[PDB]
């Protein structure tokens, strides 16, 4: 019952590191290299 | 704001955003090509 | 360009701003920003 | 099985036994979860962010 | 219990057969018809 939460939050923490699809897993380094009107694009495969 | 370059469009980042990062580490490459061929220079576009 | 951004001295000629004074800012390391406050550490690190 | 008075808490002795046998060790995220509260040394350590 | 079994892989299978908005729904055609940078959209597609 513990490994199972821990291994869940952990694969949902681990999660954040992928791009799906994106330039880049992190939304600051997407915000601070790509101006709003393109950014949502590669933003909103991050939420997806 | 030099209207020597009538073609100054970027690709990975956005124009307005270069004057944020300092580089220390860029690949500038040079050489001249037909005018028509100048859209064919981008990526994963065929062309000759 | 790279994906590391870091070292320094490739950028526009810019003059340095003032600092907040640990605050809660989009402090701007190497180029790489982050929402976060000063905070001193004094842990051993590796010189690379 | 019966409570010891003698230790701190009202636990029993089997108990005891029990509450050992399970470990956070093997368990990065809540392992560390719990340091931060024993944490005064790190300036605005507010690991509920 | 098998019949439920049974209509889940066959419908599990039988969605292979759908395109999800791509040209096409077989993996390999859509290389054999489209260069690699611009397939990367479409292949993208079958995969979610």
Redesign the interface.
Known sequence: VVNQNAQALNTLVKQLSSNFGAISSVLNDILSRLDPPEAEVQIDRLIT | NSASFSTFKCYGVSPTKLNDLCFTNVYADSFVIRGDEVRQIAPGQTGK | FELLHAPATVCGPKKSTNLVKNKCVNFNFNGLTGTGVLTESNKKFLPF | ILPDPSKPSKRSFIEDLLFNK?T?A?????KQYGDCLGDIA???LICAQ
């Open positions: 399970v956070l093997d368990a990065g995220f809540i790190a300036r605005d």
